[PDB]
Design a protein around this ligand. Structure first.
Ligand SMILES: Nc1ncnc2c1ncn2[C@@H]1O[C@H](COP(=O)(O)OP(=O)(O)OP(=O)(O)O)[C@@H](O)[C@H]1O
Ligand SMILES: Nc1ncnc2c1ncn2[C@@H]1O[C@H](COP(=O)(O)OP(=O)(O)OP(=O)(O)O)[C@@H](O)[C@H]1O
Ligand SMILES: Nc1ccn([C@@H]2O[C@H](COP(=O)(O)O)[C@@H](O)[C@H]2O)c(=O)n1
Ligand SMILES: Nc1ccn([C@@H]2O[C@H](COP(=O)(O)O)[C@@H](O)[C@H]2O)c(=O)n1
Ligand SMILES: [Mg+2]
Ligand SMILES: [Mg+2]
Lengths: 193, 193
């Protein structure tokens, strides 16, 4: 079982993925939680680079994918083999939305890089935490983090276009309170688990 | 002017590229010399990773391309804009030969990644330093470095198959002595410069 959380900065992915992890552990599933980029020794080095350095979008994309490739090969494929539930804080839709709809790289190209890095491993379900950018920005403000409204609007649209066309994507209203959003996620999850 | 040296380990790329650099500087060209992977701050971090860590071939390929993307955007494109002669110690044929023919990844795929990382920037000439693996291994032995014969035989064949099909590739007999090889390179170079 592979569960992917996707969405803009401040949509509650980290929080909700952690909530889903504890909940499922208590219910007796063997669970892993990983973030992208990151999740491996090598992946975390690349994460530090992606956050530290001034990078063009192409170099950026290739490093996101490298982190994913390492994570898929080192952790996710074996995790899935042992019937672990695998929960991802960001995955392949994030790459398309940010690098494609956001920074203007070719979407078919991103998709083929995604296919390559994941060896065609796809989620059973993707949870799109959709939220107005204004609301996501106010939440980040409370944590002293400031993101680009213009850029996130395009990204958000991207994410929503991808949910119409890509398979097994459920749009969750992430604008609610923490517990409301979690119980919307559980209903979407009841579909598959 | 973009000049690329390609070929197996111990073929004399580093030595000949450095020789070509000093020669052209003396003749009054403005010259850059860069290695792949490496050549930028970020590229060299990735280099250290690629030489340090146990990596699957997919992750490897994506990090080789990330380095290249950084080098293209940070150094090569602007170097070419200012009419510098740019000399590369390894470039895009090496990727195909090592990751494609060597480790079995798809060659069309590597070529499309190459296209992406370089923004379609192609060399004016590529110098393939071809050498028998037995001879390259004897040279590396003198420096206490030991590489995999079985792997390099495939890689060498790959390099040679690419020189037949890809554009502007000259096969230099790298088995000769240092000064003989340099003379052959200068002849090949007279074609374009
Ligand atoms: N339903 C909610 N209502 C209000 N605030 C929330 C809700 N869920 C999470 N938060 C808080 O708002 C912020 C959301 O951040 P979180 O890290 O969960 O989102 P994220 O999508 O992981 O962001 P990023 O991509 O930037 O890491 C946090 O400070 C979190 O504690
Ligand atoms: N023509 C030659 N004959 C004998 N030895 C040589 C010749 N040219 C270079 N060498 C030596 O052989 C080794 C291989 O040269 P060099 O480092 O340039 O090859 P390379 O293709 O860069 O190898 P690598 O990819 O492993 O760095 C060096 O230690 C060098 O001193
Ligand atoms: N495909 C992706 C995924 C994440 N990111 C960025 O990575 C940063 C930190 O990641 P987290 O959201 O996982 O903490 C975010 O600010 C986000 O904008 C990106 O630019 N492209
Ligand atoms: N595409 C590439 C390029 C270099 N390499 C490796 O990089 C290493 C460093 O050698 P250089 O000095 O030629 O960069 C070599 O051991 C070579 O086999 C690889 O595996 N795939
Ligand atoms: Mg987060
Ligand atoms: Mg060398």
């Amino acid at each position: 079982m592979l569960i992917a959380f996707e969405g803009i900065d401040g949509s509650g992915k980290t929080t909700q993925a952690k909530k889903l992890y504890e909940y499922l552990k208590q219910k007796g599933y063997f669970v892993s939680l990983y973030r992208e980029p990151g999740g491996t020794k090598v992946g975390e080095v690349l994460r530090e680079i992606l956050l530290t350095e001034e990078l063009d979008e192409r170099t950026e994309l290739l490093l996101f994918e490298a982190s994913r490739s390492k994570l898929i090969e080192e952790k996710i494929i074996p995790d899935l083999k042992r019937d672990k539930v695998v929960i991802l804080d960001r995955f392949v839709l994030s790459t398309i939305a940010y690098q494609g709809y956001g920074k203007g790289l070719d979407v078919e190209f991103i998709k083929n890089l995604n296919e390559f890095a994941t060896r065609g491993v796809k989620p059973d379900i993707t949870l799109l935490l959709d939220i107005p950018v204004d609301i996501a920005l106010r939440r980040l403000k409370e944590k002293n983090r400031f993101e680009n409204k213009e850029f996130l609007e395009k990204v958000r649209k991207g994410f929503l276009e991808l949910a119409k066309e890509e398979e097994n994507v459920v749009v969750i209203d992430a604008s609610g309170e923490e517990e409301e959003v979690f119980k919307e996620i559980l209903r979407a999850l009841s579909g598959v688990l």
